[PDB]
Design an enzyme around this catalytic site. Structure first.
Site, PDB file in Angstrom:
ATOM      1  N   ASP A 138      -4.354   8.644  11.284  1.00  0.00           N
ATOM      2  CA  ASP A 138      -5.183   7.523  11.767  1.00  0.00           C
ATOM      3  C   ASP A 138      -4.506   6.719  12.876  1.00  0.00           C
ATOM      4  O   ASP A 138      -3.324   6.378  12.750  1.00  0.00           O
ATOM      5  CB  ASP A 138      -5.521   6.532  10.640  1.00  0.00           C
ATOM      6  CG  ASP A 138      -6.049   7.194   9.379  1.00  0.00           C
ATOM      7  OD1 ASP A 138      -6.131   8.436   9.310  1.00  0.00           O
ATOM      8  OD2 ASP A 138      -6.387   6.444   8.442  1.00  0.00           O
ATOM      9  N   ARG A 181      -7.943  -0.268   1.103  1.00  0.00           N
ATOM     10  CA  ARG A 181      -7.175   0.032   2.312  1.00  0.00           C
ATOM     11  C   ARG A 181      -7.939  -0.056   3.627  1.00  0.00           C
ATOM     12  O   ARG A 181      -9.178  -0.100   3.638  1.00  0.00           O
ATOM     13  CB  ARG A 181      -6.527   1.423   2.197  1.00  0.00           C
ATOM     14  CG  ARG A 181      -7.502   2.551   1.923  1.00  0.00           C
ATOM     15  CD  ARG A 181      -6.777   3.894   1.851  1.00  0.00           C
ATOM     16  NE  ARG A 181      -7.696   4.992   1.540  1.00  0.00           N
ATOM     17  CZ  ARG A 181      -8.095   5.324   0.312  1.00  0.00           C
ATOM     18  NH1 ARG A 181      -7.667   4.644  -0.751  1.00  0.00           N
ATOM     19  NH2 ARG A 181      -8.934   6.335   0.147  1.00  0.00           N
ATOM     20  N   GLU A 227     -13.515   4.834   4.066  1.00  0.00           N
ATOM     21  CA  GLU A 227     -12.227   4.612   4.733  1.00  0.00           C
ATOM     22  C   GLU A 227     -12.420   3.911   6.093  1.00  0.00           C
ATOM     23  O   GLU A 227     -13.536   3.854   6.612  1.00  0.00           O
ATOM     24  CB  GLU A 227     -11.444   5.922   4.872  1.00  0.00           C
ATOM     25  CG  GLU A 227     -11.116   6.570   3.525  1.00  0.00           C
ATOM     26  CD  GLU A 227     -10.033   7.621   3.594  1.00  0.00           C
ATOM     27  OE1 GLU A 227      -9.222   7.681   2.643  1.00  0.00           O
ATOM     28  OE2 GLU A 227      -9.988   8.396   4.578  1.00  0.00           O
ATOM     29  N   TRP A 284      -9.453  16.373   7.933  1.00  0.00           N
ATOM     30  CA  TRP A 284      -8.548  16.493   6.776  1.00  0.00           C
ATOM     31  C   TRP A 284      -8.550  17.865   6.079  1.00  0.00           C
ATOM     32  O   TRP A 284      -7.560  18.249   5.450  1.00  0.00           O
ATOM     33  CB  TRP A 284      -8.810  15.385   5.757  1.00  0.00           C
ATOM     34  CG  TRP A 284      -8.024  14.121   6.000  1.00  0.00           C
ATOM     35  CD1 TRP A 284      -8.528  12.883   6.277  1.00  0.00           C
ATOM     36  CD2 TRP A 284      -6.592  13.976   5.976  1.00  0.00           C
ATOM     37  NE1 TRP A 284      -7.503  11.970   6.418  1.00  0.00           N
ATOM     38  CE2 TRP A 284      -6.306  12.613   6.240  1.00  0.00           C
ATOM     39  CE3 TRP A 284      -5.529  14.860   5.749  1.00  0.00           C
ATOM     40  CZ2 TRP A 284      -4.993  12.114   6.287  1.00  0.00           C
ATOM     41  CZ3 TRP A 284      -4.218  14.364   5.798  1.00  0.00           C
ATOM     42  CH2 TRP A 284      -3.967  13.002   6.070  1.00  0.00           C
TER      43      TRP A 284
HETATM   44  O1  LIG Z   1      -2.072   7.797   5.373  1.00  0.00           O
HETATM   45  C1  LIG Z   1      -2.908   6.981   4.545  1.00  0.00           C
HETATM   46  C2  LIG Z   1      -4.045   6.530   5.458  1.00  0.00           C
HETATM   47  O2  LIG Z   1      -4.855   7.643   5.762  1.00  0.00           O
HETATM   48  C3  LIG Z   1      -6.216   7.393   5.575  1.00  0.00           C
HETATM   49  O3  LIG Z   1      -6.405   7.727   4.176  1.00  0.00           O
HETATM   50  C4  LIG Z   1      -7.368   8.103   6.263  1.00  0.00           C
HETATM   51  O4  LIG Z   1      -6.948   9.318   6.861  1.00  0.00           O
HETATM   52  C5  LIG Z   1      -6.352   5.889   5.518  1.00  0.00           C
HETATM   53  O5  LIG Z   1      -7.527   5.435   4.852  1.00  0.00           O
HETATM   54  C6  LIG Z   1      -4.990   5.477   4.936  1.00  0.00           C
HETATM   55  O6  LIG Z   1      -4.577   4.249   5.471  1.00  0.00           O
END
Ligand SMILES: OC[C@H]1O[C@](O)(CO)[C@@H](O)[C@@H]1O
Ligand SMILES: *[C@@H]1O[C@H](CO)[C@@H](O)[C@H](O)[C@H]1NC(C)=O
Ligand SMILES: *[C@@H]1O[C@H](CO)[C@@H](O)[C@H](O)[C@H]1NC(C)=O
Ligand SMILES: *[C@@H]1O[C@H](CO)[C@@H](O)[C@H](O)[C@H]1NC(C)=O
Ligand SMILES: *[C@@H]1O[C@H](CO)[C@@H](O)[C@H](O)[C@H]1NC(C)=O
Ligand SMILES: *[C@@H]1O[C@H](CO)[C@@H](O)[C@H](O)[C@H]1NC(C)=O
Ligand SMILES: *[C@@H]1O[C@H](CO)[C@@H](O)[C@H](O)[C@H]1NC(C)=O
Ligand SMILES: *[C@@H]1O[C@H](CO)[C@@H](O)[C@H](O)[C@H]1NC(C)=O
Ligand SMILES: OC[C@H]1O[C@](O)(CO)[C@@H](O)[C@@H]1O
Lengths: 509, 509
Positions: B24, B152, B204, B288
């Site tokens: 990210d 988060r 997210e 992902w």
């Molecule tokens: O690496 C952890 C991070 O990666 C993510 O899960 C999305 O790819 C975020 O939501 C989190 O902050």
């Protein structure tokens, strides 16, 4: 005319017209006195592609797998025109005034359909006095005309609570499902508009029905909606909304978007009318992107299997359950089992493949697997197992399609790529599709999943975790080839998957 | 460490860390005084995969294409932990109390991020006194703790109208974007929860920002939202909602679901803070499902280009317009043009292909086409033209990716399939994708469309009809191979497509 692909290409237990073109299923209903399921369908007898004079074709079944195709049920007034999609209701109390004491209450059949004319789409009705085989159009058609060329696909039902007929119909390019009311089937009043979900290009074939929640006396209203083109998967797709209905407006419980089937080939879904005990429906098993280009002759298109629809609370993540549409195929005892392979508590490895070895093949198989993911660290390229559907070896070649599961992604996948087979618009024929699913259950700390798949010569239907998600895809093996044997394989040297139960059957109509 | 794929695999103008793993993008902001764009990112320097000790990496640019990688900006207290995603604001008026009169107002930099600890995710803050290169964590962290493991990705902004700082953050597995307000950046109050769109597995990286409407002084509030896994395309995807915001509740104008980018590889989008003139953002350019398995070394992952976001009323069908998110790439004049092909009013036929004939290749190209669809009836398999992106010949073979348009379907497509390139989880590496779009314009009765594409060694970004839809996808050619020439071809003998304007350029850093 000379070329018939049936031998290797024509499904055994999915309805296909003998010849010509089929799209949307129409007028789905059950005759309680004749004990007969009726399937009507968008039908062009004159080509293996969509074309006008467009008709309602007609088939009947006593079991939802064996179909008897009849003469055309409804046709347009001119070659310029078409009888577009629609539904059927049984007007038990003759609210319509079409029926004598001479017509049995559950054979009082009324079709409600879109009449397509140059520059005009209207809702018309027609009645049958012979159990749904021939129709007389209403003298004062159209019953609804809003001066539109984008106004189609009526699904009508008797709503007990508000003591009236309800029609859900799409105002296609306005992105509105329109809910009308009638005491008559003749005189309609617009009660409300519904707009939500994934819009894509157009709204088509709406549906609205009360669906039972499993293990309870409760139910929800479910609005169905077809969109094409502009599916996020490319082309055509069905979606749904869960909520409540008062006879006037549909109110969803949330504003989330969900698809009915996440395969490429499940469109224009409709439910059967007059079903006692639950909700049954089926769809057109193709995608508008390439439907008229696929290598079948002298017909194109099948329906999906009939499916039974419920609602269940399922985990969409580890924390949260969502009330979710569940579907499972209707497969009666009239389906014969030619042969079967059964296995129990198998720790799958590369030196332990499951391999079907039946005598011949009718090209119709199902497989039913419950499996557990073991605690084993394996290299990233090996966190999966695969179900291979293989043709016979013809001219020194075997065609296959693959269905698998990857434990690192908690996702099933299909790969329907078959080399060498080309047809127009195959750029849109997506080969790889996936489906993320939380475990069905936990056996201690071990994640449990289930899969049921049925393959019928050119169509595979997959049901993950007892119908939690469904995925429908056609596939086209090279000339002469069809499914002959199934294998279950993995590359892991130690067991990552235990197949607690494996049942693979060869079936026949 | 021994293998370096950069020469054929490493993008030239998309940011990539020199070594290790990136996901990210974080803390995006412009420094008005230093005249610098800042990019931070989820970073693991120790492997080419995600892993704890997780940090914020850091890079800057003057022009959003040439990036200078810096020392790590923020790290965890223990190997057991990670500085997860977050954003940066500039505290001009020193509401936080962190900043002297010795710190320029445009340089009063505060990072707000998720602190990940075993069994706990909290929102924390840190301040920079050196223009965003080193950070000091706030004494009384966490600033928000709801006793959750799934909480988060804070995006914060100053909201003038309600005179407060706003945080959007997600309660990931609850399917809620939570909106908090603060006068302080330290003390927060929960104002509302928002739940809508495609849920997938998890919410997210939310964002909420005023996006300018074209040819207007007005704007709409757009809520951004990342979901993974469970994207309808498989894996990870970004979506958006258009509506109004009052400092407390976000109210969408409708309840429709729409995606930001309909390629496979555009996730965790964030916008830059402190932008005058419009809205700029970028994303992580992978998915992902397979991000940690693609054949690059000694790094994995790039960002997308910076994109410029506006709102425009566009036809989603022939009858109806929708206020739609539009995006176009940021490409300054600091980009060198090594060579170009430029053509005007050319007709495409099988005997008039467009072929690039440049002396060498840096592996970075753009193509910019405006085309008209002519009234010509052609056979079903020929209603298309294709842009071929070809490698140099290595082991007597050329690798190619394909971008095309089919006139019968009014749809662009990509095919990123490359033979003989294998890597783990490629079952999820969808090769074929499409995008339906109504014409950009009509020249008389003729449909007009536009296409801009940029190819940068392993990533292709496509923008249809002046940014009406965007599609981002990585691709992986065989070892040593990278884009060398571009062709535009068709099989039609007579012209079906007229290329009004074609500009293909070989570009360099
Ligand atoms: O690496 C952890 C991070 O990666 C993510 O899960 C999305 O790819 C975020 O939501 C989190 O902050
Ligand atoms: C429903 O939509 C149509 C637009 O086609 C409009 O005529 C009508 O006023 C709307 N009715 C309601 C109750 O919203
Ligand atoms: C469908 O399932 C319902 C439960 O809702 C059950 O009552 C019914 O018998 C089933 N019907 C068929 C045809 O499978
Ligand atoms: C699959 O097997 C289970 C028993 O494990 C059974 O309950 C179920 O009915 C089977 N499903 C189908 C569709 O045959
Ligand atoms: C991870 O990388 C950082 C570089 O910032 C380094 O300090 C540390 O040694 C590494 N830790 C582990 C556990 O490999
Ligand atoms: C927002 O969501 C949380 C669940 O985490 C809940 O506790 C809270 O009451 C909600 N607030 C509002 C205003 O709905
Ligand atoms: C983004 O576009 C707007 C026009 O809407 C313009 O004002 C601004 O300068 C652009 N930003 C960049 C970095 O090109
Ligand atoms: C593409 O070309 C058009 C006209 O030739 C131009 O106006 C536009 O700026 C170009 N777009 C990009 C993204 O370079
Ligand atoms: O054949 C015309 C029919 O086909 C459909 O467009 C969907 O495939 C319907 O909405 C219409 O009734």
């Amino acid at each position: 005319l000379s070329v018939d692909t049936s031998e290797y290409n024509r499904p055994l237990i999915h309805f296909t017209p003998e010849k010509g073109w089929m799209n949307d299923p129409n007028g789905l209903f059950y005759d309680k006195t004749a004990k007969l399921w009726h399937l009507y369908f968008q039908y062009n007898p004159n080509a293996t592609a969509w074309g006008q004079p467009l008709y309602w074709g007609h088939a009947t079944s006593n079991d939802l797998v064996h179909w008897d195709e009849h003469e055309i049920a409804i046709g347009p007034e001119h070659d310029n025109e078409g009888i577009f999609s629609g539904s059927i209701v049984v007007d038990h109390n003759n609210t319509s005034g079409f029926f004598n004491s001479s017509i049995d209450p559950n054979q009082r059949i009324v079709a409600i359909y879109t009449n397509n004319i140059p520059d005009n789409q209207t809702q018309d009705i027609a009645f049958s006095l012979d159990g749904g085989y021939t129709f007389t159009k209403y003298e004062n058609n159209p019953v609804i005309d809003v001066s539109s060329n984008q106004f189609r696909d009526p699904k009508v039902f008797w709503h007990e609570d508000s003591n009236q007929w309800i029609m859900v119909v799409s105002k296609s390019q306005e992105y509105k499902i329109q809910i009308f009311g009638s005491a008559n089937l003749k005189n309609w009043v617009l009660n409300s508009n519904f707009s939500s979900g994934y819009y894509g290009n157009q709204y088509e074939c709406p549906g609205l029905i009360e669906v039972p929640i499993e293990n309870s006396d409760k139910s929800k209203w479910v609005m169905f909606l077809a969109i094409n083109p502009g599916s996020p998967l490319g082309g055509s797709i069905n979606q749904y909304f869960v909520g409540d209905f008062d006879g006037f407006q549909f109110v969803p419980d949330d504003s989330q978007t969900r698809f009915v089937d996440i395969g490429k080939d499940f469109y224009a879904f409709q439910t059967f009318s007059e079903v006692e005990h639950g909700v049954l429906g089926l769809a057109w098993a193709s995608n508008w992107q390439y439907a008229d280009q696929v290598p079948t002759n002298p017909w194109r298109s099948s329906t999906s299997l009939a499916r039974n629809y419920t609602l269940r609370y399922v985990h969409t993540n580890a924390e949260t359950k969502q009330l979710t549409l569940i579907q499972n195929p209707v497969l009666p005892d009239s389906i014969n089992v030619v042969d079967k392979l059964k296995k129990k508590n198998v720790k799958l490895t590369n030196k332990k493949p499951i391999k079907t070895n039946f005598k011949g093949s009718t090209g119709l198989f199902d497989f039913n697997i419950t499996f557990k993911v073991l605690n084993l660290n394996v290299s990233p390229g090996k966190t999966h197992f695969d179900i291979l559907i293989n043709s016979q070896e013809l001219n020194s070649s075997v065609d296959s399609i693959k269905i698998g599961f990857d434990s690192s992604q908690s996702s099933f996948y299909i790969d329907r790529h078959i080399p060498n087979v080309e047809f127009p618009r195959k750029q849109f024929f997506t080969d790889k599709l996936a489906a993320y699913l939380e475990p069905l259950d936990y056996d201690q700390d071990l994640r449990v999943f289930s899969l049921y798949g049925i393959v019928d010569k050119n169509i595979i239907e997959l049901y993950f975790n007892d119908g939690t998600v469904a995925m429908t895809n056609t596939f086209f093996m090279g000339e002469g080839k069809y499914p002959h044997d199934i294998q279950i394989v993995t590359d892991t040297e130690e067991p990552l998957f235990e197949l607690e139960s494996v049942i693979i059957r060869e079936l026949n109509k």
